[PDB]
Design a protein around this nucleic acid. Sequence first.
DNA 1: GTTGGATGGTAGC
DNA 2: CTAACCCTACCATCCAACC
Length: 341
Amino acid sequence: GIVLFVDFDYFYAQVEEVLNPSLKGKPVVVCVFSGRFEDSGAVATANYEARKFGVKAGIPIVEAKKILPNAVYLPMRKEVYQQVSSRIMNLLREYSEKIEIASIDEAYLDISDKVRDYREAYNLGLEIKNKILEKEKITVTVGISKNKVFAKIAADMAKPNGIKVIDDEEVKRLIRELDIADVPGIGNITAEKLKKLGINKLVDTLSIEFDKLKGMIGEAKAKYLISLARDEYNEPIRTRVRKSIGRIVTMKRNSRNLEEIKPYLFRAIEESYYKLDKRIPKAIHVVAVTEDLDIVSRGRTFPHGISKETAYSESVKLLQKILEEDERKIRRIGVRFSKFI
DNA sequence: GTTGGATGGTAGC
DNA sequence: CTAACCCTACCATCCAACC
Ligand SMILES: Nc1nc2c(ncn2[C@H]2C[C@H](O)[C@@H](COP(=O)(O)OP(=O)(O)OP(=O)(O)O)O2)c(=O)[nH]1
Ligand SMILES: [Ca+2]
Ligand SMILES: [Ca+2]
Ligand SMILES: [Ca+2]
């Protein structure tokens, strides 16, 4: 069982570089401008030139301009990156039909039937990197291992423009030696709980009682972590089926005023419903980000598919329910559809 | 006990 | 307006319905 993983390098900014080659070699920051004030919003991503100075995903645009005023700031053009991505996903399809598109910039290939061993896998990695480079001028990082998790870790260890194999023996080693915080699915909350327990390595999860581990991090995470330490993790590559689709937007200013919010909600519904594309949802959720960045939601599941009109009426009601039950002003409003027929 | 709906937490993009 | 966007996957917990 061999898995090949592809993660595109500094994706959004790299795409801007390919569109505009004069940008290459200098700092580029791709931004989400919220319109609340001059330069309000956050960085979506930046090239390596900009990361050298601390500019990266998630920081505020003004914070990036403070620490890097002369960089090139461009607005996130989501659709453009999606088009480049799709073309790249189709190139990858010509290498294995058995492909899991896992996000805007990454995919898993099961190549067990394409190659005999890690060596040939490494070589396909080379051919894949070159082809994506011929056709789209985009550099990627390849990770190759026995499963999804270690193929992801391998690519993380090689970024940028790298390729890395983690073979059966280094999986053993990594189980004993890799900091557990570095395992995909282990964020800052789980990391801290593990530290208190004195669980630092995957191997450590085999020397603690399940109930005690499950009591701290929850069942599924405990199962997942143990499965990896036992080297019995084998989740198959599966065709990507979206479970929810939606849209969220930032308001000019914070409001508790239904009439001042409505236009944004409706903008989010039109865009959401368009992205459904023949998919018919049975659930709608209105999502509100409050003044203090708390995420709050109200939803409804129908026994039947929701029409655009039903979505219009229900989300207004659902918004009012948020206003009824939470006293805070709202800052971002959106809508999410799930449970596709 | 099972399934699943409402809502929130965590994670990573 | 004074920093904090976009999008999706998955799970936990608190309850209700089933039977
Ligand atoms: N709006 C927004 N977009 C994000 C965020 N994080 C990532 N993205 C988008 C932009 C990225 O280019 C793309 C892929 O995310 P990655 O984590 O793989 O980062 P990226 O490819 O830019 O860096 P890479 O060289 O792996 O390190 O997803 C975020 O916090 N907000
Ligand atoms: Ca990625
Ligand atoms: Ca990437
Ligand atoms: Ca981590």
